[PDB]
Give the backbone structure.
Amino acid sequence: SIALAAEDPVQPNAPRNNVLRYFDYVFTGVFTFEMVIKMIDLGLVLHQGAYFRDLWNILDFIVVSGALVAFAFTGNSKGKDINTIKSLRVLRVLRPLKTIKRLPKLKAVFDCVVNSLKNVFNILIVYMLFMFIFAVVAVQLFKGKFFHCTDESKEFEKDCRGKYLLYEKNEVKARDREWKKYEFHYDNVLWALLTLFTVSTGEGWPQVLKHSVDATFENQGPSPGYRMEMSIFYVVYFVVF
Amino acid sequence: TDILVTEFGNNFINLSFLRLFRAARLIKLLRQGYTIRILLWTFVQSFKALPYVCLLIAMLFFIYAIIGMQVFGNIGIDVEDEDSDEDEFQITEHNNFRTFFQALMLLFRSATGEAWHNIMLSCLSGKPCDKNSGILTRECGNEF
Amino acid sequence: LRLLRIFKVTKYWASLRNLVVSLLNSMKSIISLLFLLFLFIVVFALLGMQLFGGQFNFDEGTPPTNFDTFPAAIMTVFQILTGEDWNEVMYDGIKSQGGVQGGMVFSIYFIVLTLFGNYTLLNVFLAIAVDNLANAQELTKDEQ
Amino acid sequence: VRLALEAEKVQAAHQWREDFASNEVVYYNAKDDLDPEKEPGSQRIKPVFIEDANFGRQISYQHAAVHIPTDIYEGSTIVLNELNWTSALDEVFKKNREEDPSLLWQVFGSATGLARYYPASPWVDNKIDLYDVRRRPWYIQGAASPKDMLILVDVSGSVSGLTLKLIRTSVSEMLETLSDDDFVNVASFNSNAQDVSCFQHLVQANVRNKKVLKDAVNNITAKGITDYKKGFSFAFEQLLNYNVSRANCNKIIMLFTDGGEERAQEIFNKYNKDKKVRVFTFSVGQHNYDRGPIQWMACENKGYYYEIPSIGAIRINTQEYLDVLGRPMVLAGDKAKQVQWTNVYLDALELGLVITGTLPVFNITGQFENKTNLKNQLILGVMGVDVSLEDIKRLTPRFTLCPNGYYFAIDPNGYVLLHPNLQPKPIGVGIPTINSQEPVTLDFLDAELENDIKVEIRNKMIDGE
Amino acid sequence: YTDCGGVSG
Amino acid sequence: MILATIIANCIVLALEQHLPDDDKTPMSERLDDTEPYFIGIFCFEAGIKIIALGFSYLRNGWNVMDFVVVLTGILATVGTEFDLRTLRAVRVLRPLKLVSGIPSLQVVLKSIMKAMIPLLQIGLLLFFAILIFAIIGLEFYMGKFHTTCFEEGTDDIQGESPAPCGTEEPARTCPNGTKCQPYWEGPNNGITQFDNILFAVLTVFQCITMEGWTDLLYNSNDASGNTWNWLYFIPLIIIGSFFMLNLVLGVLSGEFAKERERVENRRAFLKLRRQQQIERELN
Ligand SMILES: CCCCCCCCCCCCCCCCCC(=O)OC[C@H](COP(=O)(O)OCCN)OC(=O)CCCCCCCCCCCCCCCCC
Ligand SMILES: *[C@@H]1O[C@H](CO)[C@@H](O[C@@H]2O[C@H](CO)[C@@H](O[C@@H]3O[C@H](CO)[C@@H](O)[C@H](O)[C@H]3NC(C)=O)[C@H](O)[C@H]2NC(C)=O)[C@H](O)[C@H]1NC(C)=O
Ligand SMILES: CCCCCCCCCC(=O)OC[C@H](COP(=O)([O-])OC[C@H](N)C(=O)O)OC(=O)CCCCCCCCC
Ligand SMILES: CC(C)CCC[C@@H](C)[C@H]1CC[C@H]2[C@@H]3CC=C4C[C@@H](OC(=O)CCC(=O)O)CC[C@]4(C)[C@H]3CC[C@]12C
Ligand SMILES: CC(C)CCC[C@@H](C)[C@H]1CC[C@H]2[C@@H]3CC=C4C[C@@H](OC(=O)CCC(=O)O)CC[C@]4(C)[C@H]3CC[C@]12C
Ligand SMILES: *[C@@H]1O[C@H](CO)[C@@H](O[C@@H]2O[C@H](CO)[C@@H](O)[C@H](O)[C@H]2NC(C)=O)[C@H](O)[C@H]1NC(C)=O
Ligand SMILES: CC(C)CCC[C@@H](C)[C@H]1CC[C@H]2[C@@H]3CC=C4C[C@@H](O)CC[C@]4(C)[C@H]3CC[C@]12C
Ligand SMILES: CC(C)CCC[C@@H](C)[C@H]1CC[C@H]2[C@@H]3CC=C4C[C@@H](O)CC[C@]4(C)[C@H]3CC[C@]12C
Ligand SMILES: CC(C)CCC[C@@H](C)[C@H]1CC[C@H]2[C@@H]3CC=C4C[C@@H](O)CC[C@]4(C)[C@H]3CC[C@]12C
Ligand SMILES: CC(C)CCC[C@@H](C)[C@H]1CC[C@H]2[C@@H]3CC=C4C[C@@H](O)CC[C@]4(C)[C@H]3CC[C@]12C
Ligand SMILES: *[C@@H]1O[C@H](CO)[C@@H](O)[C@H](O)[C@H]1NC(C)=O
Ligand SMILES: [Ca+2]
Ligand SMILES: [Ca+2]
């Protein structure tokens, strides 16, 4: 766990990563020995107390198998696929989790967290259903209305082409017109759910409110203060969720 | 000690943490607030009673910091746009993933809930890479 | 919402039904709480209109969070209560009456608003949640 | 004359295409990098420029160049159609240049913004181009008649903030679109009207009176409660003062406000009931007030309605009113087609002091058959040919004369077309404040020592004796 | 004078 | 009728628009003349109540609020000396007279306030923590945010987004054509700073509300390096925003638990349970 926190993300060829690679080899070897001895004791043929019955054993197997596979792929010609070895390197982050089972009190806290999840599951289902209804309604109201232009004077897409003068304080700059979509929109149910989650967390919801109240029509630029009655949607959402 | 350091002069400044000892006289006032002192002592004792509940959160922060380091660690920060687009360029020299401590700082800032969605947008795919990464194309950042 | 009837075939129907019954029983005491919250919001919106009002016409344009009209005042007060970007509204309010020089006394409005709003919302909604959930649990245990 | 005739005929024969293939209109664009080594319906031309000491720049006689300002896109269906039909003007350009090899420029300003000049030369080298052919003095001269403009600025409380800055900039830009033949005065009204500057009745738009008005407008502060019935009763009264000199035609009122509730029917029915004064209403700024009475005011009285929500729209909205003013002269027929020569001004393409002859181009689509006349009331553009003061100086030899002897020419306004004292420099308007577009207008009395006899001589030359 | 603008906007 | 008058006055107050400087909408001028009618009706109500009750009028707090509103309104209306508009601000409290009219809202406010009383001890802790952190910040971050990247030749800001700078490696060094010159206005137009004990308290409170505190962390990092600023900002958040929230939740939960077992709530719950048993048997 400590070694995983010392690698250099910026420079793959840094001198520290080369040293840490051999630490990775040693740790992988130790974990291979531990897994193989546990396999010898527990067995594989439906002993009903075998290795693959308890989830932590599957987690350990995934970690060690991922390490070995990552070592295997770089066996020849590393430039063929680098994302493959990258993901298997990312898989190493599960090593900290290998202490929850090995520390009885930490497992006694993890089990309490699991019970807390279990107790609130039905309320979670109701919450998801209500948020789905709200997301569908928001999709109906604001579908395709979240398109704007770099130049505010142009409403439609065909007009937003070429260059426009950006009148800044004490300098005039020529920029290009772009028919961009807003960062957080309501286009399908998934985008609506993400936007509503962002609103519920409280971050950036005034901008979403401004975009909603400036929405004019489908495939058309915003007009300030067009539909101010959309504030009731965000008031009810805040009151409810 | 703070007074002697001040009157000495020159030498090493010895920082200013000695002046925290000057300011720490306010804690002595807690000896009169019976209800307040009892409240604080009870809650501190409860926090000390539960050490592993505060370790699970630390483990979560550790795991997410390592994942961020290994996924979004190589996003370039040197680029500043003509307008700088502050809304979307939130990965800077102060809010990067380049080291463990910076990753932990970013995670804590997101936990406090301060423009975390902008960071999420800035960590998406198609962003320029760092000069020392070894990649000469805008292929840093993931949809993860 | 009719998919919530699927809970009848499970053992979770009793607790949910008791929660709904408890909510419907104390439905007047919830409407009264919401009405008092709305009254306080209206009072603070009117106060903001009296203090700041039309004075938000800066040289760069009137900010969207202004106190000019009553709907805008209500929106601004609601945003301050939710605690999102209340500091920017405070900065604009201080800037309207001069600036840091002779307008720093108007921060009391925003301080009081946010300090009262956070804890009043917490109290008003947590009391409802705790009372109804406790009633539902006790009814379920007693019926079993 | 011949260029205008050909342009009118070619417009009459045009067909309004909408589907343009990627290569259907071919031109130079006069602003592209000569070495791109690389659009929706256009194909660029890579021309050859050798040299010409007559111009000093590098020109091509093979085809004409087109200038399209930065704001206007070059792929629009309104721009591509003109880029197609104006391509017939190149033959007449070449014919004129071969008949008279001394022609410098042959520009065709267009109502959409593009300009076509025959000798293909790159445009003038943050280097952002703010040039707009629809605002140059020759185009303004050839697109309308002398005006009697009275700007009415709203200075009530509500226009405070961004609206006031936009109003000030818009008023300055509107004042920039005025010639010496035009008379203008700027007034303001919150609850009682008053003159913004020291002027009280009307002043001709010289380079100095315009600066006075601009400074007085920039000194304006906003405070009070709007009263339209006291501002219009003031504008109409200063438009009735005949003790002073004025253009005595095109009496127009400019109202710069944000929005209101009062339409003031009584004031209009009292002062302008036969409808001899045009009213143009501007809704400046970003707000949510009632833009209803001002539209009715611009509708009932002859006029048009404008909205200025940002700095970008200022230029176009201030320049558009010439299109409205141009209707009577196009309805006059082939009687307003009179060549007019502008004041001496520095050429945009750096030839020095020049004067431009302007001939309006009318809309004659469906002229033979009396079917369409609704859109024929707007001009297509203004034709222009530039003659340099060097030519006029060459027509007057001075080496047979004594050094003390010289030639000079006077226009009706009294400015010198030719004078030894006249120099290719912009006229000084005032003391320079700490921290080329304007015409070069120098009076005869300001180019020599003023004398009692020289005033009588100036008056006699103005009279034409 | 029917092109006054308000209607066409 | 008194309630109807209160509702109408609330609507009138909500139908007023404010314009900069001295501009007024035509509707506002009409609306302003209805104040005499409302103040006359309120004066009549106060007079009849005080004469019939023979003042115990001031014994009840709601009557005190109505009386003070009446006096403020009548003093503001009668006599335009000094042009007092501060006495026009008292009109915002008139919506609160609806609670005085309706006893149920009074009961609900009593229920809210009784539970809210225990939080005063938590507020004392919050004030002490804010004071300690403000003192520390004033002692460490005094006047450090008045130095930006000024122009080389002239005393002008290099750009339109000024940031704190320093004149050494740990801080943020300015570009080659700029220098660090004193007295830049400061972040957020100088509102956020540690100069007095009042600016320090306001700044610490703003950081407590978890709003804009990373901006301060970044500004201090630019001004004096990032080595030790986290030890001041992260513990500030942890102690004054999470610990305080935990205390508030605990106190409120205890108050609610004690409130549930009161006699009236127990009787209401017994009634509800008996009704539910009756409905089951009926079904
Ligand atoms: C209700 C209950 C209330 C409880 C209240 C508890 C309050 C605790 C809050 C934390 C107190 C420490 C805050 C530190 C702020 C540091 C700010 C700063 O600017 O430090 C850097 C500075 C050097 O910068 P320079 O410009 O040279 O000098 C500035 C002096 N004006 O100055 C320096 O050189 C550094 C000065 C020392 C700062 C830290 C001293 C240590 C204090 C805690 C130590 C904990 C153990 C070590 C952990 C970290 C190890 C790296
Ligand atoms: C506006 O754009 C149109 C597209 O360029 C132009 O219209 C086209 O002009 C072509 C001239 O080369 C015509 O081609 C010739 O037309 C004759 C009929 O006279 C036919 O035999 C052939 O189609 C062709 N042959 C020759 C002799 O090259 C096109 O027919 C004509 N039609 C199209 C494609 O639209 C216009 O010229 C242009 N307007 C102006 C005023 O320039
Ligand atoms: C699935 C169940 C989720 C339950 C989450 C906790 C719910 C109870 C907490 C609560 O209600 O307190 C609200 C209180 C209000 O603070 P706030 O209104 O100042 O928040 C500001 C806003 N986040 C921003 O920075 O823009 O403070 C908060 O906003 C809470 C802080 C974040 C949540 C707790 C800490 C987690 C991160 C360390
Ligand atoms: C909180 C618990 C989980 C233990 C803390 C783990 C990390 C926060 C520590 C442990 C070891 C530390 C590392 C030990 C040594 C170095 C080398 C040091 O030297 C360098 O600048 C890089 C070396 C070079 O330049 O060649 C930089 C910090 C770093 C990576 C440290 C970064 C922080 C690390 C990873
Ligand atoms: C704690 C809860 C119960 C209180 C929440 C307050 C609501 C009752 C308020 C807050 C925002 C208000 C809305 C803000 C904006 C508008 C638009 C406005 O309607 C218009 O069309 C006005 C036109 C314009 O303002 O340009 C007035 C009604 C409405 C929906 C308002 C209705 C009342 C709302 C929902
Ligand atoms: C100058 O114009 C004013 C109004 O623009 C007019 O004032 C008249 O002045 C003469 C003598 O100066 C007087 O009969 C009256 O004062 C005015 N006449 C009226 C209104 O009956 C007049 O048109 C011009 N004044 C002069 C010098 O004739
Ligand atoms: C793996 C175990 C020991 C956990 C502890 C890791 C830390 C303390 C150790 C392990 C490997 C070490 C690195 C090994 C090699 C180098 C290259 C050298 O040019 C600079 C120091 C540096 C970068 C070391 C820094 C400290 C380091 C990261
Ligand atoms: C509690 C459950 C059932 C949630 C369902 C209620 C939600 C979806 C309803 C209740 C009130 C509704 C709003 C009422 C009025 C308007 C104005 C209309 O011009 C646009 C839609 C809008 C803004 C509605 C959006 C949907 C809305 C917010
Ligand atoms: C527990 C987690 C891992 C399960 C959830 C899986 C989903 C939500 C996530 C996790 C891993 C993600 C993938 C990780 C990497 C990439 C490469 C990127 O260039 C395109 C998207 C893509 C393909 C991601 C799509 C979304 C993804 C599949
Ligand atoms: C599934 C969801 C709940 C994930 C949890 C997100 C957290 C970060 C969000 C959701 C619920 C949120 C809080 C719930 C309660 C309050 C108190 C109120 O005064 C303002 C809104 C506010 C401040 C919310 C902001 C932050 C918050 C705690
Ligand atoms: C920036 O600093 C470097 C230091 O060597 C120097 O080469 C460069 O010329 C400097 N720029 C200016 C503006 O002096
Ligand atoms: Ca925030
Ligand atoms: Ca007004």
Notes: Residues 230-260 of chain F form the longest helix (31 residues). The radius of gyration of chain F is 29 Å. Chains F and E do not touch (no CB pair under 8 Å).
